[PDB]
Amino acid sequence: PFPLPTGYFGIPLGLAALSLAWFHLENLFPAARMVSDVLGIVASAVWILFILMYAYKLRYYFEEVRAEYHSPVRFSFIALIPITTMLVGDILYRWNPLIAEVLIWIGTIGQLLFSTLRVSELWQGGVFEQKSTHPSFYLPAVAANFTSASSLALLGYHDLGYLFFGAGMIAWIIFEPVLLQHLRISSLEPQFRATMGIVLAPAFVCVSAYLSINHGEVDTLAKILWGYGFLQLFFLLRLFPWIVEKGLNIGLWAFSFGLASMANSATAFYHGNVLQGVSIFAFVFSNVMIGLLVLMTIYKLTKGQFFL
Amino acid sequence: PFPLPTGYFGIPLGLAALSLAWFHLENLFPAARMVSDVLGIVASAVWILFILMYAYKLRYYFEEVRAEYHSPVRFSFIALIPITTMLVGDILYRWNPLIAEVLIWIGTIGQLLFSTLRVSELWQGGVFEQKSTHPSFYLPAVAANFTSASSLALLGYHDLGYLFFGAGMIAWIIFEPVLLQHLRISSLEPQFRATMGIVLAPAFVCVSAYLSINHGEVDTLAKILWGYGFLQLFFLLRLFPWIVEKGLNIGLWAFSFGLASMANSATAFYHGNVLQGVSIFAFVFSNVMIGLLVLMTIYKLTKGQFFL
Amino acid sequence: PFPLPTGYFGIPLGLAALSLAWFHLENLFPAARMVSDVLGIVASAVWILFILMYAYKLRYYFEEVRAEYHSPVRFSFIALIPITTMLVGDILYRWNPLIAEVLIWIGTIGQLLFSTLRVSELWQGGVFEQKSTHPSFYLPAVAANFTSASSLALLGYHDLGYLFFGAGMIAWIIFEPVLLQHLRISSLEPQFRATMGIVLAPAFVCVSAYLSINHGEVDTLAKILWGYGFLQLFFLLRLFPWIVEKGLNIGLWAFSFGLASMANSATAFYHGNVLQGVSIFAFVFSNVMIGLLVLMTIYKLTKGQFFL
């Protein structure tokens, strides 16, 4: 097998999302920019390492890449590569806007092409099964569109960002019903339980992208999106002992994207003088959870229980 | 078996919702305030009686309470208690704002905790079944959130009300698809057919809550919500002979929440000079239907076919 | 059987939608009004011919009409008659507003009654099956409501148009999840693959109706709707070789409604100076695709492969 699973890309993804969330606090806190820079540099280094390892996989492990691409469930994790690429471009935009725009466009085109080629292929039927409805399916159809929308908004293409954001939002609200019904009916295997944290992602990622596109204006839509996001957060907090029933694992980084988007939207709301206490609580909670994830990853690295 | 099914809480629930709907017509009609006061007092008395009966059930019938709480389908009716509590708090707000706030907060916390502890347990799987997808599932995930949002808006917490309203709205949008698909596929047993009236509830309850939070402004969202609510109302009117295939019963009070929310939104739309004729028709239809429900309940009480 | 399938009504439907889209370009081009008039006249003639054929069917083939009405899947195509009637009324509104209003009201009442009588009857269950979830179900529940909303907006009834538009939009959002899940799970049979083009319709029909009701003011909702519409357009472009695996057929006109609504929304967006390049591309693409459909229909007619 390949040492690095494609699902490990959630580490740089979450770190970059948290870096952007901290970047949004540049003015109110002098060390916020330093924290954002540190997080962004760490995320960029991790993303570079993972991209090189995935290139090695393509060159010498193309059979596994083909298997995961053709699988009805594992293909969704390949969408983490363009998402993390767009996030790294967003990070670099504070230093080199040209490289940032190049990376953002590369990631947007890559994720759009991947969704067109694979997510639409499922409509043919026969390969996708009722037990293939996993939370990871948000990554190609939902998370990628929101990330592309936010990145394009960062580049100034606000109308194209609106298009991508709407695509992601409607895909999210069109897929989540069947996903939740399947979770209610057919449970979820322990090895796939860590991916339940992706259920927290779309609700907060949508509001983060919307606030990025519309210059951080807190409309009724953003408040509604936090309503659902906090409902989901409470639901998953009550289920966390069941998610980690078999123990802590690197798969819990799936919560990282949701937590970082929650922190970003929390900064946006705090800037708007709306639900300031709730925003502070959400930001602190997301930061503490991501710090615990980082500590767990460090412990796994030291103990050697990280790579496969 | 306890003489009071947990589903009988829809009587005070609908009566209180209609009382608030009439309260909204205080200025336009001099006896509207008297009608609202009468409805609110009757609803409060019925709610107090039912709360005492349920406390008796807890003290001496805790086995049945546990069975209904752990059931994947019957648990949803326990959410009627916090909803009725919040509605009674809303009623009392016109007399004792402090008691109203206390009841509203108690109900909001209770329903949020119930949804977190039970609606999220279903995701574990193995207990919820495809045949457990019933209209009653709206009560914990949807109706409770809308009622909490409207109550908080009544207290002045408009942003928290927006959060709760969005949670309820997105929960409704996420659950209704599978519910309607199941209804199309697996029919519905006669004993559960009376609960089909809850399908009418979310569309009108959402617009009622939205108009409560945003100071009764008729936005495009309210018009859209009435569009879908009237579509569903026509759909259920065509199905009413099928719903009462085995005769009228106290289960028809499930329509009461939808009718009362329709009346409240009708008052809100009439105040805004938007579709005044349709608003008057909806208000009159809701009042007449709830009066018919009250007459049926009185007939059952006299005949002795009310308690189980 | 009867020579003309009820699904052939998509020809006048698509032609009329494209005629309205071109009519929206009256001022920009001198020949735009002439093109719109030609398209509208051809669509009206085809609709008159098909209505006469369907009247002949009712008088002398009522058994087939009853069979398609009672079928859980074939009934949806009967909604094409009121939809095309409303579109023809919209066309005639430029010449005889009174006849246009009469036709629009007749079509609105007919489609509303059909949905109430049949779409709601499916909730009884036992006749609708998991394999009856086809894209054609959009026609009675979604496309009809959007067309009625747009037609009513054309007549000046903007609030009633908003009601119908919201009904259609929420019906679309409530049905698409299970439809896409079924498509992913079970492959659509080749004879029903041509109807996959109806999946493209709702996303663009919704934005077209919204622009018609709100005076073509490009709002965030319109941009979101284009986002999802273009996502679905790419998805179906990837799938087109699979849709026509067994060859081209008159069933491909199902794409006509989606393409024409895309063209109409393209005119609306170009008017507002929002994504002008994308608007031009969408308009040209829709016009070229509908022209290809027209050429295919002409070739089928010449080769005697059009009627059954």
Say how far apart CA A306 and CA B9 lie, in whole Å: 53
CA B283 vs CA A65, B10, B150, B287: distances in Å: 61, 19, 19, 6
Say how far apart CA C224 and CA A211 lie, in whole Å: 14
Q: For residues C256 and C11, is the Cβ–Cβ distance under 8 A?
A: yes
- The single-letter code of the amino acid at B232 is Q
Cβ distance A223 to B112 less than 8 Å, yes or no, reads: no
Counting Cβ atoms within 10 Å, is residue B220 exposed (0-12), middle (13-18) or buried (19+)? middle
The residue of chain C with its CA nearest to that of B269 is C159
Say how far apart CA B260 and CA B258 lie, in whole Å: 6
Supply C222's token pair. Answer: 């319109």
Our measurement of the distance from residue C247's CA atom to the centroid of its chain's CA atoms, rounded to an integer in Å, reads 22
DSSP for C277-290?
HHHHHHHHHHHHHH
Phi, psi dihedral angles at B7 (to 5 degrees):
-75, -10
Nearest to B164 by CA among B194, B184, B143, B181: B143
Min Cα separation C115/chain B (Å): 8
Q: Does A273 touch chain B (CB under 8 A)?
A: no
- Return the axis-axis angle of helices B276-303 and B254-271, rounded to nearest 10°: 150
Supply B146's token pair. Answer: 């809308």
Say how far apart CA B132 and CA B73 lie, in whole Å: 5
Say how far apart CA C265 and CA C225 lie, in whole Å: 10
- Name which of B177, B186, B227 is nearest C174 (Cβ-Cβ): B177
Q: Does B189 touch chain A (CB under 8 A)?
A: no
Question: Burial letters for C184-199: b for 16+ Cβ neighbours within 10 Å, e otherwise?
Answer: bbebbeeeebbbbbbb
Q: What is the distance between the terminal CA atoms of chain A, rounded to a whole angstrom? A: 7
Kindly give the residue spans of alpha helices, DSSP state H, lying in chain A. Answer: 10-23, 32-60, 62-70, 80-92, 97-114, 138, 144-155, 158-186, 190-193, 201-213, 220-243, 254-271, 276-303
Nearest to B214 by CA among B151, B147, B161: B161
Nearest to C148 by CA among C120, C117, C121, C115: C115
Say how far apart CA C19 and CA C257 lie, in whole Å: 11
> In this complex, which chains have at least 3 CB pairs below 8 Å with chain A?
B, C
Say how far apart CA B23 and CA A249 lie, in whole Å: 55
Say how far apart CA B12 and CA B301 lie, in whole Å: 15
Q: Does C64 touch chain B (CB under 8 A)?
A: no
Cβ distance A163 to C227 less than 8 Å, yes or no, reads: yes
Supply C220's token pair. Answer: 């965030």
Nearest to C290 by CA among C256, C264, C249, C265: C256
Supply C87's token pair. Answer: 């579109």
Q: For residues C137 and C183, is the Cβ–Cβ distance under 8 A?
A: no
Say how far apart CA C249 and CA C141 lie, in whole Å: 25
Counting Cβ atoms within 10 Å, is residue B183 exposed (0-12), middle (13-18) or buried (19+)? buried
Count CA atoms closer than 13 A to C19's CA, side-chain side. Answer: 25
User: Which residue shows structure tokens 């509203």?
Assistant: B104
Count CA atoms closer than 13 A to C228's CA, side-chain side. Answer: 26
Kindly give the residue spans of alpha helices, DSSP state H, lying in chain B. Answer: 10-23, 32-60, 62-70, 80-92, 97-114, 138, 144-155, 158-186, 190-193, 201-213, 220-243, 254-271, 276-303
Q: Does C307 touch chain A (CB under 8 A)?
A: no
Nearest to B251 by CA among B204, B291, B197, B201: B197
Helix (H, G, I), strand (E, B) or coil at A43: helix
Say how far apart CA A124 and CA B62 lie, in whole Å: 51
Q: Which residues of A touch C231 (CB under 8 A)?
A: 115, 145, 167, 170-171
- Name which of A116, A123, A166 is nearest C228 (Cβ-Cβ): A166
CA B232 vs CA B183, B228, C252: distances in Å: 14, 6, 32
Cβ distance A275 to B159 less than 8 Å, yes or no, reads: yes
Beta-carbon pairs below 8 A across chains B and C: 101
Supply B297's token pair. Answer: 């309940």
Per-residue DSSP letter, B95: T
Q: For residues C39 and C94, is the Cβ–Cβ distance under 8 A?
A: no
Q: Which residues of A touch C196 (CB under 8 A)?
A: 123
Q: For residues B213 and B158, is the Cβ–Cβ distance under 8 A?
A: yes
Cβ distance C166 to B196 less than 8 Å, yes or no, reads: no
Say how far apart CA B268 and CA B279 lie, in whole Å: 9
Cβ distance C224 to A159 less than 8 Å, yes or no, reads: no
Say how far apart CA B148 and CA B164 lie, in whole Å: 7
Number of domains, chain A: 1
Supply B70's token pair. Answer: 């752990």
Say how far apart CA A131 and CA A128 lie, in whole Å: 8
Nearest to B177 by CA among C135, C176, C80: C176
Q: Which domain holds residue A283?
A: 1-308
Q: For residues A89 and A107, is the Cβ–Cβ distance under 8 A?
A: yes
For chain B, after which residues does the C atom lie more than 2.5 Å from the next written residue's N, i.e. where is it broken?
none
Say how far apart CA C49 and CA C3 lie, in whole Å: 13
Cβ distance C181 to A133 less than 8 Å, yes or no, reads: yes
Nearest to A287 by CA among A266, A263, A261, A269: A263
The residue of chain C with its CA nearest to that of A119 is C235
Nearest to C211 by CA among C275, C290, C271: C271
Supply A36's token pair. Answer: 């954002």
Question: In chain A, how long is the greatest CA-to-CA distance?
Answer: 55
Q: For residues C251 and A133, is the Cβ–Cβ distance under 8 A?
A: no
Cβ distance A171 to C228 less than 8 Å, yes or no, reads: yes
Cβ distance B173 to C175 less than 8 Å, yes or no, reads: no
DSSP for chain C?
--SS-GGGGHHHHHHHHHHHHHHTTTTT-SSHHHHHHHHHHHHHHHHHHHHHHHHHHHHH-HHHHHHHHHSTTGGGGGGHHHHHHHHHHHHHTTT-HHHHHHHHHHHHHHHHHHIIIIITGGGG-SS--GGG--GGGHIIIIIHHHHHHHHHHHHT-HHHHHHHHHHHHHHHHHHHHHHHHHHHHSPPPHHHHGGGGGGTHHHHHHHHHHHHHTTT---HHHHHHHHHHHHHHHHHHHHHHHHTTT---GGGGHHHHHHHHHHHHHHHHHHTTSSHHHHHHHHHHHHHHHHHHHHHHHHHHHHT-S--
- Name which of B125, B160, B164 is nearest A184 (Cβ-Cβ): B125
Say how far apart CA C225 and CA C268 lie, in whole Å: 13
Supply A102's token pair. Answer: 């190049």
Q: Which residues of B touch A202 (CB under 8 A)?
A: none
User: Which residue shows structure tokens 């496969």?
Assistant: A308
Q: Which residues lie below 8 Å from residue C139, measured CB to CB, with a gap of 6+?
A: C76, C77, C79, C80, C83, C198
Say how far apart CA C43 and CA B180 lie, in whole Å: 35
Say how far apart CA B126 and CA A290 lie, in whole Å: 31
Q: Which residues of A touch B112 (CB under 8 A)?
A: 234
Supply A118's token pair. Answer: 């694979």
For residue A57, how many other CB atoms are within 10 A of its CB?
Answer: 18
Cβ distance B180 to C174 less than 8 Å, yes or no, reads: yes
What sign for the dihedral angle of Cα B132, B133, B139, B140? positive
Residues making up chain C, counted from first to last: 308
Count CA atoms closer than 13 A to B168's CA, side-chain side. Answer: 32
Q: Does B230 touch chain C (CB under 8 A)?
A: yes
- Residue of A131, A181, A188 to mutate, testing the B interface (most B Cβ within 10 Å of its Cβ): A181
> Would you tell me which residues 203-222 of chain A have a C-beta closer than 8 angstroms to some C-beta of chain C?
214
Count CA atoms closer than 13 A to B148's CA, side-chain side. Answer: 32
For residue B274, how many other CB atoms are within 10 A of its CB?
Answer: 17
Supply B71's token pair. Answer: 């059931």
Say how far apart CA B97 and CA B110 lie, in whole Å: 20
Say how far apart CA B304 and CA B94 lie, in whole Å: 35
Q: Which residues of C touch B234 (CB under 8 A)?
A: 112, 115-116, 120
Rg of the Cα atoms in chain C: 18
CATH number of the domain to which A7 belongs? 1.50.10.150
For residue C99, how many other CB atoms are within 10 A of its CB?
Answer: 13
Nearest to C258 by CA among C196, C202, C192: C202
Q: Does B272 touch chain A (CB under 8 A)?
A: no
Q: Which residues lie below 8 Å from residue B269, measured CB to CB, with a gap of 6+?
A: B218, B222, B226, B275, B276, B278, B279
- Name which of B220, B239, B274 is nearest C123 (Cβ-Cβ): B239
Q: Does B276 touch chain C (CB under 8 A)?
A: no
Q: Does B240 touch chain C (CB under 8 A)?
A: no
Q: Which residues lie below 8 Å from residue B203, measured CB to CB, with a gap of 6+?
A: B225, B226, B228, B229, B231, B232, B258, C170
Q: Does A191 touch chain B (CB under 8 A)?
A: no
- Name which of B176, B237, B274 is nearest C174 (Cβ-Cβ): B176
Our measurement of the distance from residue C244's CA atom to the centroid of its chain's CA atoms, rounded to an integer in Å, reads 20
Beta-carbon pairs below 8 A across chains A and C: 100
Say how far apart CA C53 and CA C51 lie, in whole Å: 5
Say how far apart CA A253 and CA A294 lie, in whole Å: 9
Q: Which residues lie below 8 Å from residue B189, measured CB to CB, with a gap of 6+?
A: none
Measured at the CA of C224, the angle between CA C17 and CA A74, to 5 degrees, comes to 110
Say how far apart CA A100 and CA C239 lie, in whole Å: 33
Q: Does A192 touch chain B (CB under 8 A)?
A: no
Supply B26's token pair. Answer: 């205080």
Say how far apart CA C38 and CA C31 lie, in whole Å: 10
Q: Which residues lie below 8 Å from residue C171, measured CB to CB, with a gap of 6+?
A: B228, B231, C141, C142, C145
Helix (H, G, I), strand (E, B) or coil at A250: helix
Cβ distance A230 to B167 less than 8 Å, yes or no, reads: yes
Rg of the Cα atoms in chain B: 18
Per-residue DSSP letter, B105: H
Q: Does C224 touch chain B (CB under 8 A)?
A: no
Q: For residues A227 and B166, is the Cβ–Cβ distance under 8 A?
A: yes
What sign for the dihedral angle of Cα B137, B142, B148, B154? negative
Q: Which residues of B touch A274 (CB under 8 A)?
A: 159
